[PDB]
């Protein structure tokens, strides 16, 4: 039938989607800025739709409750028909691709380690062989599920520690994890995606660092409900923006051009 405004679910996560400084005097999509705000505008332009950015109600990326089988987060908003598309740092995973569609990836990432500068940690293996430095991940996200489901030796060992550690090593938001690194005098390391790690590394007070290689290799995709008619066009739009260099331009714009820790 007639064209309808597309409901976009997304998540407040720097530098993907942020409230503008003067957001309180702005309306609708103009309240927000960031990589995914720019990406949404480009996708909509190339696919020919109007859209409304909405922040995911529960603040979560998306995981399935093992007892009720109900999906939360942005994934749930797609599954249950509350949003038409998710444009966010939403990680492509097997279990999610069973219930929603993902475009080809628009950004690469892997799980990585954030330390406060000077922490004597260089790798996941180092973390797994000590207990002085606690370490954890974000809840309801792909990083936690990676460790939970993993049968890889070192990652299995880390999960056995994290799931039982008291007090909890898990956090509800990326910001909470970063703050915990910064205020723990080196006694907490945060496991998070390399994209977010590398962003924070270039933000004041310039006291965190990514260390070691990434633990895996995956990416973020634009997600739609299974079988949605938007999926085909959105997938091609991602590939076009990739081939034009726009994804590279936007990454530089939001990570490094704005960097606060020097011109390195």
Ligand X SMILES: N[C@@H](CCC(=O)O)C(=O)O
Quick check: 247 binds ligand UF5 (CB under 6 A)?
yes
Count residues contacting its own copies (CB under 8 A)? 28
Say if residues 84 and 224 touch (Cβ distance below 8 Å): yes
Quick check: 149 binds its own copies (CB under 8 A)?
yes
Quick check: 106 binds ligand UF5 (CB under 6 A)?
yes
- DSSP class of 84: S
Say if residues 32 and 25 touch (Cβ distance below 8 Å): no
Closer to Cl ion at the Cβ: 91 or 208? 91
CB of 28 to its own copies, least distance (A): 31
Say if residues 56 and 89 touch (Cβ distance below 8 Å): no
**Parallel, antiparallel or unpaired: strands 32-33 and 18-19:** antiparallel
- Nearest-angstrom CA–CA distance, 28 and 55: 11
Annotation-wise, does 142 bind a ligand?
Answer: yes
- Nearest-angstrom CA–CA distance, 39 and 41: 5
Q: Which span sits near its own copies by CB under 8 A: 34-42, 156-164, 185-193, 237-245? A: 237-245
Helix, coil or strand: residue 59: coil
The pair of three-digit structure tokens given for residue 3, joined into one six-digit string: 């064209």
Closer to ligand X at the Cβ: 49 or 109? 109
The residue from 233, 242, 259, 261 that contacts ligand UF5 (CB under 6 A) is: 242
Say if residues 145 and 95 touch (Cβ distance below 8 Å): yes
Count residues contacting ligand UF5 (CB under 6 A)? 12
**63-92 binders of ligand UF5 (CB under 6 A):** 92
Which helix (H) or strand (E) is 210 found in, with range?
strand 208-211
The pair of three-digit structure tokens given for residue 88, joined into one six-digit string: 């966010």
Closer to its own copies at the Cβ: 182 or 218? 218
Considering CB distances under 5 to 8 angstroms, the limit depending on partner class, which of ligand X, Zn ion, Cl ion, none binds residue 95?
Cl ion
Residue closest to ligand UF5, measured at CB: 219
Annotation-wise, does 193 bind a ligand?
Answer: yes
Closer to its own copies at the Cβ: 146 or 188? 146
CA distances from residue 244 to 36, 49, 115, 152, 248 in whole angstroms, order as listed:
17, 21, 35, 38, 9
Given the structure tokens 């933000």, which residue do they identify? Answer: 203
Cis peptide before 205 (omega within 30 of 0): yes
Helix 35-47 to helix 231-244 angle (10° resolution) is: 120
Helix, coil or strand: residue 245: coil
Q: Which residues bind ligand X (CB under 6 A)?
A: 61, 89-91, 138, 141-143, 192-193
**245-264 binders of its own copies (CB under 8 A):** 245, 247-248
Annotation-wise, does 120 bind a ligand?
Answer: no
Annotation-wise, does 195 bind a ligand?
Answer: no
The residue from 12, 55, 92, 95 that contacts Cl ion (CB under 5 A) is: 95
- Nearest-angstrom CA–CA distance, 78 and 226: 9
Going by the annotation, the residues of the binding site for L-glutamate are 89, 91, 96, 142-143, 193
Residues that bind its own copies (CB under 8 A): 92-94, 97-98, 102, 104-105, 108, 146, 149-152, 216-219, 235-236, 239-240, 242-245, 247-248
Residues that bind Zn ion (CB under 5 A): 24, 42, 65, 67, 156
């Amino acid at each position: 039938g007639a064209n309808k405004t597309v409901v976009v679910t997304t998540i407040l996560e720097s530098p993907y989607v942020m409230m503008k400084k003067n957001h309180e005097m702005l309306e609708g999509n103009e309240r927000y800025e960031g990589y995914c705000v720019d990406l949404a505008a480009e996708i909509a332009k190339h696919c020919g739709f109007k859209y409304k950015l909405t922040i995911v109600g529960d603040g979560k990326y998306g995981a399935r409750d093992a007892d009720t089988k109900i999906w939360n987060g942005m994934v749930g908003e797609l599954v249950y028909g509350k949003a038409d598309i998710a444009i966010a740092p939403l990680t492509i995973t097997y279990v999610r691709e069973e219930v929603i569609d993902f475009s080809k990836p628009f950004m690469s990432l892997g799980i990585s380690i954030m330390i406060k500068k000077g922490t004597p940690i260089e790798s996941a293996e180092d973390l797994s062989k000590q207990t002085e430095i606690a370490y954890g991940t974000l809840d309801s996200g792909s990083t936690k599920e990676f460790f939970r489901r993993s049968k890889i030796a070192v990652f299995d060992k880390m999960w056995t520690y994290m799931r039982s550690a008291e007090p909890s090593v898990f956090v509800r938001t990326t910001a909470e994890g970063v703050a915990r690194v910064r205020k723990s005098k080196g006694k907490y390391a945060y496991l998070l995606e390399s994209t977010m790690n590398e962003y924070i590394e270039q933000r004041k007070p310039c006291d965190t660092m990514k260390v070691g290689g990434n633990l895996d290799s995956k990416g973020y995709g634009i997600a739609t409900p299974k079988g949605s008619s938007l999926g085909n066009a959105v997938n091609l739009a991602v590939l076009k923006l990739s081939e034009q260099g726009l994804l590279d331009k936007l990454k530089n714009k939001w990570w490094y051009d704005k960097g606060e820790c020097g011109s390195g």
